[PDB]
Each structure stands twice: as structure tokens, then as C-alpha cells.
Design an enzyme around this catalytic site. Structure first.
Site, short mmCIF file in Angstrom:
data_model
loop_
_atom_site.label_atom_id
_atom_site.label_comp_id
_atom_site.label_asym_id
_atom_site.label_seq_id
_atom_site.Cartn_x
_atom_site.Cartn_y
_atom_site.Cartn_z
N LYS A 61 -4.95 -10.43 -11.61
CA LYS A 61 -5.38 -10.79 -10.48
C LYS A 61 -6.80 -11.42 -10.90
O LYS A 61 -7.24 -11.46 -12.17
CB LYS A 61 -5.67 -9.63 -9.51
CG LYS A 61 -4.38 -9.06 -9.25
CD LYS A 61 -4.69 -8.01 -7.66
CE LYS A 61 -3.30 -7.27 -7.30
NZ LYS A 61 -3.76 -6.63 -6.07
N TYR A 71 3.34 -12.21 -0.53
CA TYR A 71 2.85 -11.03 0.26
C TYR A 71 3.57 -11.38 1.60
O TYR A 71 2.95 -11.24 2.60
CB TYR A 71 1.65 -10.76 0.42
CG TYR A 71 0.65 -10.31 -0.76
CD1 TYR A 71 -0.18 -11.26 -1.52
CD2 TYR A 71 1.08 -9.22 -1.35
CE1 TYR A 71 -0.92 -10.59 -2.41
CE2 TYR A 71 0.14 -8.52 -2.68
CZ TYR A 71 -0.44 -9.40 -3.11
OH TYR A 71 -1.37 -8.81 -4.38
N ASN A 114 -7.98 -4.40 -8.23
CA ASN A 114 -7.22 -3.67 -9.16
C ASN A 114 -6.76 -4.32 -10.24
O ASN A 114 -5.70 -4.11 -10.62
CB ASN A 114 -6.42 -2.70 -8.28
CG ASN A 114 -5.24 -3.69 -7.86
OD1 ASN A 114 -5.30 -4.66 -7.57
ND2 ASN A 114 -3.95 -2.86 -7.54
N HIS A 173 -1.41 -7.19 -10.87
CA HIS A 173 -0.20 -6.85 -10.16
C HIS A 173 0.95 -6.76 -11.28
O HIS A 173 1.02 -7.57 -12.03
CB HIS A 173 -0.13 -7.89 -9.02
CG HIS A 173 1.41 -7.91 -8.64
ND1 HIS A 173 1.99 -7.25 -7.88
CD2 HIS A 173 2.36 -9.08 -8.99
CE1 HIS A 173 3.09 -7.64 -7.53
NE2 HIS A 173 3.41 -8.89 -8.35
N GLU A 202 9.91 -12.59 -7.44
CA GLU A 202 8.68 -13.18 -7.60
C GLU A 202 8.63 -14.23 -8.75
O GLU A 202 7.71 -15.14 -8.28
CB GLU A 202 7.86 -11.65 -8.05
CG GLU A 202 7.29 -10.72 -6.91
CD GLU A 202 6.73 -9.60 -7.35
OE1 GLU A 202 6.54 -9.20 -8.52
OE2 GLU A 202 6.25 -8.73 -6.53
#
Lengths: 145, 145, 145, 145, 145, 145
Positions: free
Chosen positions: A12, A52, A108, A111, A122
Site C-alpha cells: 500500500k 474493492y 496497514n 495487502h 486480483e
């Protein structure tokens, strides 16, 4: 044997800005896993809203570049999730990427995929089939029965 | 105090070929444990069939050299097993040798003992008593009450 | 947001003598936490008997210098305890400071706080308010939502 | 090709006591060099007086155990000397073992050979021919033309 | 012996903001040098104008906190300068702090003393005599003849 | 300021097979340099014969995948060459990528550009202009005057 499982691991943009790139790529390289494609990309309005499948979370992901990678190897998806650690950093264990580098659920660091089905869809979104390399990892013979 | 417990930690030949030697020896050195003997050895038909007291597993162990080591220190056997992690890499945790470097049950990088009784028999097979060094680790006084 | 939580993390004098200082400070630095004060100090008869609010444990703590530090950041207290690992090294997990470097309950390398209330009293004993720095960590914006 | 050159690299007992073993062995492993034999040994009055072919230097070398190793690979002797750095730590450069870990000429952490002739005689003293392993390093094909 | 030489090593505020603290402190700890005092401090108009005995360089040094440290050990001053590397990062060598982490002369991560006389005056400015600890480093006996 | 210099740094296929990827990318990330594009690619007969503007050297470069990267930052080209070290591994210094990991001139782990002119032509061959990302590195303000 079917050790061609591939997960998608992306750093990220906190990750990227924070300098954690080479660091995160270590944990995969040294485990014996196979880098299979990689690019740096500023995420698209389209590319994203399709990923998403939170109004503020959008322009976060747009706010930096993203290291998108693909890693081949046995049980790589689950092992990926393992290496990254609990998705909320405040409960992931040390030794994991999230537990070593992260604090906020919202930041975080990276991913990973949660399913073979997740990963495959993905990857095909994030890369074309031409972009993916296959070679045999020299270490393969010593990594696997 | 009886902190003379000794386990046998060997780097299997995947370990060795893969370059993981110094790396694995770290986790023991820096924990405060005491290297007490060490050799590189190509395993024997005899030496082996006596160890593992699978027809294919045999010529695997013969197929590379093996780093055999012995490490002294308190609760070293259990701590060894801890440092190596679950024997199946696909369920050992990151931070452990197996979870950092391994994927296949069959190529799980190293072996450690599972009992004081296991270790002691294992060491005496793999080394003669002359071959084992004792010194006091300088750090002993700061490592132990 | 209230991400001004501060725990007290001190490297006990085994830690210090053993050379583990920079090493321990890593795990905090790289997690994204904020060093906020730090000193090296030989512990006082007074300073101590007031801290631990065991006749032999006393002159242990006096027997070396101590690295006292303070670290600011969200959930830093619990995350600190997490990073250090189980207080008895023989049951703390690898990846943690205690599980990587320690063996003896009595020589467990460092101390961290167990409560916001613990920490705050602990810091004010170990440091004056003047001694504590606040700056904004450049990385703040990328560390936190 | 003749890439069978072998030097003797031993960690002096400061090295060993100080915890530098795994660390020193890294620089060799990761360079691509081949561990070929290794043992831990308390040095002999005989073994020594024959080596160094200073009355105080003697009982220093006896005062700890010594990690004796042998490493195979091209130009390994000179590259060994390179990796160790200038023999006086106070003028060896950082990145080298002596410049990273050492301060005193007298406590200079390890020894390496200075000649093919030096090494070969040195190895045959420190090891018997049976004790030395040859295997092909898996990485050989990628390390060498 | 006179191995009580002490240099002043401070991490400039780029260093600190950039996360290089623990990292920089490593190179000193692991060399065998002795941490002797340390504090985090936002630099004073006075404290500064007295140090550098450039109108823009001033408010740079004020613009972050500074990690001031003192390190004892033989030839520590020159070895300090060595470990830091050439003052202009664009010509310091890799392995040194400046060559590993730095690019701009103006943002060169840390400062070290250039003379015994430099250091001593520098330390007494930056610390009071009470603030400095002496202990014997356990490792001393193995570090020095 | 003109700190937009960009060099091309590629990990040759020895590098890649040998597991040196994350490792090599460190030295650049942590220096403060900016990853700006990256891909994994099996080299083309065309792509190659146009690059190296040796009949055996060809099918070496084809024999594995190649990590092509581009890195932005001041004096990045010369600093790149510096970080890689002398092109012949047997005379590059430790601390550099070639001196840490390499032995053979022919297997020298990676390539970097030798000129601003070299790099720019090299990048435009290896990448299209769309493929290159620009963002501001968060750390920029602390890296540069």
C-alpha cells in the site's frame, strides 16, 4: 506438482512512502517464493472501484504510488496472509510485516489476497498475462520434494 | 545451576545448499546459547539408518552435506524446537527458522532434538566426546541468575 | 486523535552489557513509534525502592547501567508489552525481544510498562517533564489515519 | 575451471566469546563461497607453536575456543583477506569484519590465510583430509561463468 | 591502559526524523564501543551559537530533535569519524553511515567530533558531568589486550 | 533543485536466481533514493542486441528473468555505480553489492548506468514513459536542503 499457486501482494502507499519496500520483498524472497511480476503504479479511479468490489479510503489509495507484485509457490496465498499478519496491526504478531511495521488498521502497510479465487481475479485486474514471467527458480529443487 | 542442557541442531542439506547456515546459527548465538561442537558431514548409510531408528528420504539426506551442531544452555532443547518452529513449515510461525525459510514438510531446512533423551543419544552418535568443547561463555554471568 | 500514549521501555543492565541496545531500539523505531526521551543511568537505592513499589534483585539492577526510554504512539503500552514478549523468556515467542535474546526470567533483558497508569507514574519517576521532547514525527501522516 | 582455491578462516577466541560467529560466517556464505569444513577447538600447545612458525599471545589463543573453518571458491584467499580487512582494526575499513567489530590489533576477532601456500599448509595442520567435504554448491552454476 | 577516549556522536535531526537512530547506534555498539551518555534534545539558540563557534543552517538544527550521545573507547574519535564516513555523503563510501543513508552535504544524518579537544569541549557543552555513566563493559576483557 | 537525475539499475539474472533482489533494492531505498519504475522481464533478442550497442554473454542474459528498475535522486547515477562497486567483483570493496555478493566478472549480479546519457537512453529502451511514476517521497524534505 501443483506449486504454481500465485498470490497478489501489494505494498500500500504507506508502505511505499515509509521506505518498506525492499524489506517487505525480503520476507517473500527468502521464504523461497518466486517473484513473477512487479510494477509501481499510481492507482486509477476505475482500477480501484473495480478492485474493492469508506469515501476517504479511496483518495488514500490514490495519494501515493503502489507496489503491485505477484508471487508463485505452494500454499503462497495462505502463507502470504501469514507473513503479513493480522489485518489490524494492533493484533498482528511480531515477525509479521504488519506487526513489525504497522499501527493503524487504516495504514496497514500492505495487502495480500485471501483466496486463490481472490488472488487470480486480483492479478488479472492489476496485470496483463504478457507482463507475468515464468522461469524455474534455481532453488526449486532444494525447496520442494 | 544445571544449565548444561544440550540439544543437537542440524541444518539439513536443503538448509546448507540454500545458503541458510550463518543465518540459522544466528538465532542460536544471539539467544545466548553456547556453541559446543560443529562439523560438516556427508551422511553415511550406517550413520543414518541408526539415526532415524520413506525409501526416498534416505538419499535426500545423502544428497548434500549436513551441518551438525551442538548447543549448550538452559532449556535449550525446548527452546531449540521453539526457534525452529512447527515441523511442517506450512504451519510454523514467522520469526522461526522454518516459518521464515521453509515451505515443504519434506524440505524443512533443519532438524532439532525433541527430548533431552533424544538429544543426548543423537549427539553421541553424531560426535565423539573428545570433539565437544567446554569453555565458559563470557556472557554467562549476564545471561543467567 | 489521541495517539499520545506513552510507555516506558527500559533496557535492564543485562540488555545493556550484552550489547542489545540498538537492537532493542530498532523494534520500536521501525514500528513507527516515537522516541520521546532517553537516558543512561546507574539506578539509585531510592529511585529503585520507589519503582518496585527479592533482596538479591536489588543489587542486580544496581550492578550495571540502565537504558531508560520513553516512546509515544497509539496503543504503545500494549504494543510495547507485545514487542517485548512474555516476561518469562522461556515462554515468549521468537520475533519478540525476550524470545530472540533471553533465557532467564531473572535476566530478561528489558522492562516495559503494563498499564497507561503504570507507565505514566513510571516515566515521571524516571524523568522530569523538561527532559521529554515533542516534535511531530515526519512519518506520522503515513502511519496514521 | 580452477575455482577450487581454499583458504582457512578462523574466528579467534575474542570473536567466539563476543558472539560474532554467525555474523562472520555470513559474509562468506552470502558472497557465494563454499563451507568445506568447520570445527570448534580449544588450541593445543603443540598445534599452536607449529602454526605461528609474544609469550603472552600464546595463552590468549588457548584462553577460549576457536572456530576453524575452510572455504572453497575462486580467489577465496585474497577475497578472504579482503572481507576481513586490514589486520590492525584501527585502520581497516567499515564493511569488513575487522572494521565492523574490532578495535585492538591484539584482539582482531579472526584470522585468514595470506597465501595459497599459507592456507594449504594451515588447513592440513588444523584438519585431516577425511574431515573436508566436497559437494557442488547448487548456486555454483549462477555464481560462475 | 588509556582507552578512555570519548567522542561525541550526535544524530542530526534528519537522522532522527528519518528513523536512523537504532541503526546508527548499532555501528557503535557492535564495534565494541561503550555508550556513556545519551539524550534527546531540541537544540537551543544559545546551546547552538556556542557549538558552531549559514543563517539557514541554524533553524534546520532547531527544526527537529537531536540525539546527542557520548561513546568511550580507544581511538573512538577517529574511529567515529571513520564509521560516519566523509562529511559530504556524495563521496563517503558504502559501509559508512553517511554513505549508506545520506545524499546531501546539508543533510548528512549525523555529526561526530574531529579531535579529542573537539569532543571534550563538545561533550561538556551538551552534557553535565553528572549525566555521564561509567561502568566496565563486560566485553572489555575480550575487546582489548 | 535538479535532483531528478535517474539511473537505471537492473539485477542481472544471477542476482535474481540467487535471491538477491530485496537485498539489492535495500541499498537504494535506504539511501533515500526513489523507486520510480520496476518490472520483471525475460530479455529479448532485439531488446538486447540494441542495449549492448561475447556470443555466449547473449544467452546468459536470456537464461533468466531480469529485474529492471529506475531510481530518481541527486547524483543517483554516480551513487549507483558507487553502491554497486567495481564492475569486476574481485576488486570491488565490501559494503558494495558486487563486493558483498559477487565473485565473477561474468556473474556480477547487477548492472547500473555509467552516465546520465547512458541511463536516459537505457531507461527509454527498457520502459515506456507511461510506465514511470512520479510522486514526491515523503522523506524528500529531510533528505535534501
Amino acid at each position: 506438482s501443483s506449486q504454481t499457486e500465485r498470490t497478489f501482494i501489494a505494498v500500500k502507499p504507506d508502505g511505499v512512502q515509509r521506505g518498506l519496500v525492499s524489506q517487505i520483498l525480503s520476507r517473500f524472497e527468502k521464504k523461497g517464493y518466486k517473484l513473477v511480476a512487479i510494477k509501481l503504479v499510481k492507482a486509477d479511479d476505475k482500477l480501484l472501484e473495480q478492485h474493492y468490489a469508506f469515501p476517504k479510503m479511496v483518495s488514500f489509495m490514490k495519494s501515493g504510488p503502489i507496489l503491485a507484485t505477484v508471487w508463485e509457490g505452494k500454499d503462497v496465498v495462505r502463507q502470504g496472509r501469514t507473513i503479513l499478519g493480522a489485518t489490524n496491526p494492533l493484533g498482528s504478531a511480531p515477525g509479521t510485516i504488519r506487526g513489525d511495521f504497522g499501527i493503524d488498521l487504516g495504514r496497514n502497510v500492505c495487502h495480500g489476497s485471501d483466496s486463490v479465487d481472490s488472488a487470480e481475479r486480483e492479478i488479472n485486474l492489476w496485470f496483463k498475462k504478457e507482463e507475468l514471467v515464468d522461469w524455474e527458480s534455481n532453488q526449486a529443487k532444494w525447496i520442494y520434494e
